[PDB]
Symmetry: D3
């Protein structure tokens, strides 16, 4: 009785997951009328089923958010037993606190619960406490282990983990612990805090948006005598001049995951993308059958 | 009062600017940008603590983007301690998805989203279905727009006119206008056929919304094909998506009358055309609502 | 684990349904104390069962509404697994919009959900959008097909479907499509709009309340040269002088359903009542077992 | 203020008219008819936008009809943008169904219905159970009615009196009156027996409600049968259903004292009887509540 | 799939129950940090299970209330299927009505539902209508039968049941009906109402807190010529000088239940404690398997 | 206005008394006792019907007792018809339990409890996590406390200073202070190691909370061990549980700076120490909030 659907955000990721678990993406239409309104029409009875919806609320965030919500509404109204959401990328998660502004990450939670979600599955939220913005169950998969493993495997010499900013220090520590390495941060107010001479430095953030912060960081590192420089993040937002900026940066290589569907029209040069499909696929099953999900950490 | 702060999001600023000027107030200062990211950014550069904020926004194309900024705004205001957050919606997008099989009822989902976000009340103009009004549990005032069009045509001084309902759902609206003008009604039983006398008459086609202009142009031509003196068309909401304009410019429609509830496509112009403003009405509605003077008086 | 109960509105309809599906109406007392308060006392354990309640909120609407709500409350408090409501006739559905008035159809929805309903099954609501006044699942059975079939079977000549008023046009179309006939409406402000000379006209509304609107319509038709006249509606409210007015009308025959229990003390003369028990009975099962309910349209 | 609009539904208009006159206000104008259909119709012919509306209604026989109109009224008002919708319930029907097996707790369901409909607050008089007060989450002020009856009897100047509790639940209420009159108490341990000295005494029977008058008449007669000087009976809520009147007119009760919280049956009259008004109290309660002057001062 | 947990209130009672039903108290830590905050850490996957929590909100009420709530939250967030609460002693139940005060018994209900409870099982609430403060199902076990049986068994002569105060009369009647005895009350404003000369009197209240009310009652009885005096209550709160006062009273014997864990440091002399474990144990099962719970009255 | 009623529960009365005196108001009269039973008793001896009540309470040790009385108070006030029930929390207990496995998120449960009880809004000071702010849906103003400490140190006129983050989460806070003082930052990468130049410097250790004083003392000593001119330490919330005091009195900390958000242990005194008051700030916050004057101006 398990049905999985993919909306428009990251279909390639969604089929990969579906194949790993072993089902066919649901028969559903997420269409559009002449104006600009979405017309969801579920092409099959899901009465009493456990439906999983896969969707990253990546660019354009508002459109993806709305179709997600409308789908939920369609499912709820159509008598699904559970409506479970799998969000590889939680858009608006940076707007998690306040001088005279909204807290969109919270508004979203509230919208999703209103719409009718039963539970949520997420990957590396910008702030781990966003988890508390919900009152329905939510499982938080972490993504650092994946990158750690790819780096661990690289066998680089005297490496140092670097936090591009003041909020990254925790994440940097998590990765520093894996590779058993020291940490240093970019005190950009721009300055380096910590020994980093002749070292292989790895820059890491949760999201690489405009690639502004990070490229500037990599160059400063080099400018301060670092053997070579790598950069990784979970969510490849790469908006604006991001690609051009990186292709021109000193970054030996950029490591990212497929939580967000890559821009088809512009390619990073030195680059590697790891998949998170295996991880989410495993969580679906484990949640669907009620097996320890904590077992994956 | 000085607690009447009014904001305009991106849907129809010209209309907003107008309703604010008419009222006699400066549009609240508010950063309503989008990050390059596409996510919506909001700064409200003016303490609104304890104020009564009115937000003006049509959820017209693109509906999902406008809906989201509206919601985010509300959230900003609620979190920033506004006293009341009142929504003025000249055009309620998704009002066509008002029932089901296995389909959603987006007009209802929206209501639910808006109340969740934190709205205090709503002001609307000609909803596709008057019962959408009941999808809310917060107060909502529903302004009719027919009177405005009625009046334009009345001063046109036409003779031998018949009001026409393009479809099976328009009959009520057609009646409202037929009354206001003391004219008979006829409908297009498109299954396509005319039901009622219309020979040599000046026919006025009326719908709440003119979207693709498909339904209506085809209607006008059929009228002509059935010997009607001349043909006019009106609606409140000018959605005009797709080939709408081209289709009308080529239609037999002597003239198309619409309101400025939805911001007109800047890049394509109807030829024989007239747009009436609904700013005076909403401005009036806001005032009455704000000071608690009867508004039923409009309706 | 399926239990069905009948309150006081339309017990004959309720037993018919119960027999079709195959169970015994629940052991429950819907009594009254000396004053005028209802005393519900469920004569059997329904702990963990799926309870279906059958009730039309017909005259007197307020009494029927209250017992329904009290029953729900009794069931909820007694640990039913699901409390599902089957409403053959949704009273107050005409009060679905606003000059300075309530929207009772919405207040009701809200009351029913507060009381504890799990879902609703309805037949021909005055306004299809009332369906959206709820946030719990609701299935809307339509009743026109039934009447269409009885008319289709009649083999009448050059028939025309007539909408007694400006709101009936949609319904009229639905029936016009069945019998493959043309439509005409009564533009009562009173006038006929459309060809209807020498035709067999069928008047149709969702409800025939005081029978005012409709009788006056039938006579006007005749007065405008119509071969003969029939009239149908789903819900036979027939309040006031309704019967007398029809018995005196020109209506060759009046077709109605048993959604509302007929006045025992006054009989229409030329008349036919079709049952909706088979339809609802089928919906119960299909909902209870989770089979496509959309399959019935 | 002029924002104190008061409405009366059908339960007890004489009482309502009185509380309005006392306060000094004209009862809000409101069509509160029923369609022939039996469904309840409502028009509120007077903009109440932004006003503070008080609704007066006992949910007495028929309880379900009165409950429904009350709810529909509230809905009308909420949808029509009243500022506050405050309910004044002289008699809270269903207060006897206050706990369970497989039975409902209607007093609670009601609270939940009233809040759902949209009430802002409630004012009540002698609930069958004081803890019903906790079934709400909106503010509720509970007026006691014993003081009123206490005072009538006090000025009667009787001697050698004993307060009697008709049953096991009345003992508290009996105490309240025994105190207010400095008298002893005795109860009817009906399982039927007297518990306490009562010989040659003037006994006063008191219950919150006198419904079928079954319990109480039988009590009075037993008292007499046990040598009591004379017997009086009082209660706040005169439900008097069934054979109540006949039973009392035939009882040994020298006199029955009640309040006008429930509208008296027009077609049958008690013989030896006295009705005290609770209008002055509620009127007072409304005023204090409305201007926010302490009301605990009553209680 | 049934798991039972015990928090800190009455663990002895909790194990007794667990043994009767047949399971092991859950693997969970209800710890404390240096400051004073509780750290709940559920030592095992309960995903999809039906969890029963046993806890009396006895002294200290606020601490016990908070751990209960935190546990619920932990369970809800951890995906329990149902979170069912067994409360042998409902603290704050005397604060059930209002001159300018809170109604804590109601605030509590609201807190418990917010936290995430599915249902409640309680024993002798101070006010039976507290039952209505909830909107989730609640089963109310009564405790008088137990004491009745112990008294019935005692074979005492011409006994009279006594209500220490004006609110106890109902409870007194329930017990008077068991032993087929008459009732009398203490009209303390202090006076006796009813014949009680040379009789064996049994004083009964739901709770014996400071033992003030009751000891003073017993002595008055004696002072009015009563053959001998016994006293019973369900909930042994015994705060303050309670024990000393009773040990010095004329009470031949005090009968109580183990709904509240007895003060380890001070012992009543003439005393008997009956267990309520068998009763609750039976309710767990019957609720868990959905069998008539009403069957136990 | 005279509708600014302020109450103090048991957490930090000296602070409360101060914020009330500063504002210029008499602390609302309210019995806030506990029965011998241990259950909390509440009488509010002063009609507050229609008033705007502010409650001051840190949910410091014992957290559960303070939380419960706060909730019960709110309940009392809500049931007693207060107009607004506004909470001032100098110290938000449980802010450390802000995420998960199989653990609760008590900071969130609390928010949910407070809103259920009936709060209208919240005023807080330096939450452990700024996003806790989003756990609420009622308005909440978050006051930063760094400015206060910044200023003390600024007037100390030190030279060659470095701000130090005891741990991986403090880096932001350290930056805020480094900025306000134009100093560099260094952190303790305790996995224990120093990251950044700190030789011969005057180091200031800063955390939001100093609980067991474990983390920080060990940090100060390591600094010294790495050749730092001298060492100071500051935090907003002085939890000082366990061996905290003893550990600091023995540490190398030249001086410890804290605020009075949490009431100091009466039985044990730090030696080299300075406590700054946050009363002026909250007092100011209350006023701005109450009259609806911008408060962002603080932050
Ligand atoms: C760097 P931080 O400590 O994560 O601070 C978060 C800030 O980034 C901003 N922000 C939120 N949405 C973002 C977006 N899409 N574009 C850029 N930054 C974002 C917000 O103003 C927020 O206060
Ligand atoms: C418009 P109607 O003929 O009164 O019936 C409503 C129908 O319009 C459809 N619909 C909803 N959104 C639409 C849109 N943007 N464009 C066209 N039709 C739409 C619905 O599927 C529904 O079947
Ligand atoms: C004919 P319509 O377009 O369905 O308009 C509905 C109107 O009928 C009225 N109405 C509602 N309840 C009704 C009833 N029981 N009696 C008569 N008409 C009703 C309402 O005032 C409502 O506005
Ligand atoms: C009235 P009591 O003796 O205090 O106990 C309450 C009982 O009255 C019953 N009851 C509820 N509604 C009633 C009514 N209208 N008439 C008589 N008894 C009723 C309940 O079933 C309950 O058992
Ligand atoms: C004797 P009663 O009729 O049960 O009245 C209940 C009263 O006892 C008081 N009360 C509540 N909590 C109590 C406690 N823990 N200590 C003493 N009495 C309590 C309350 O003020 C309440 O109004
Ligand atoms: C404090 P951190 O190093 O920023 O990470 C938060 C951790 O502190 C823990 N925690 C929560 N409450 C605590 C308390 N009172 N004392 C110490 N740690 C606590 C949580 O378990 C969580 O793992």
């Amino acid at each position: 009785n398990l049905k999985i659907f993919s909306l428009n955000s990251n279909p390639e990721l969604a089929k990969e997951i579906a194949d790993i678990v072993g089902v066919q993406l649901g028969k559903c239409s997420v269409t559009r009328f002449s104006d600009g309104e979405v017309q969801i029409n579920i092409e099959e009875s899901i009465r009493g089923c456990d439906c999983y919806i896969i969707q990253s609320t990546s660019d354009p965030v508002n459109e993806h958010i709305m179709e997600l919500l409308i789908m939920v509404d369609a499912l709820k109204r159509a008598s699904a037993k559970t409506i479970n959401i799998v969000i590889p990328y939680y858009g608006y998660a940076r707007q998690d606190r306040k001088s005279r502004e909204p807290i969109t990450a919270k508004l979203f939670a509230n919208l999703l619960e209103t719409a009718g979600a039963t539970r949520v599955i997420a990957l590396d939220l910008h702030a781990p406490q966003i988890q508390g913005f919900f009152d329905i169950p939510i499982d938080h998969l972490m993504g650092v282990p994946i990158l750690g493993e790819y780096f661990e495997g690289k066998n680089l010499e005297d490496i140092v983990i670097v936090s591009p900013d003041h909020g990254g220090v925790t994440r940097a520590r998590k990765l520093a612990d894996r590779l058993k390495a020291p940490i240093a941060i970019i005190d950009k107010r721009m300055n380096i805090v910590g020994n980093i001479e002749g070292k292989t430095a790895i820059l890491i953030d949760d999201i690489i948006d405009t690639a502004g912060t990070i490229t500037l960081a990599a160059n400063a590192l080099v400018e301060n005598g670092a053997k070579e420089v790598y950069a990784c993040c979970t969510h490849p937002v790469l908006s604006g001049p991001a690609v051009e900026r990186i292709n021109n940066s000193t970054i030996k290589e950029l490591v990212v995951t497929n939580s967000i569907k890559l821009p088809e029209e512009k390619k990073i040069e030195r680059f590697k993308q790891l998949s998170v499909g295996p991880l989410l696929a495993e969580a679906i099953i484990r949640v669907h059958e009620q097996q320890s999900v904590s077992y994956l950490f």
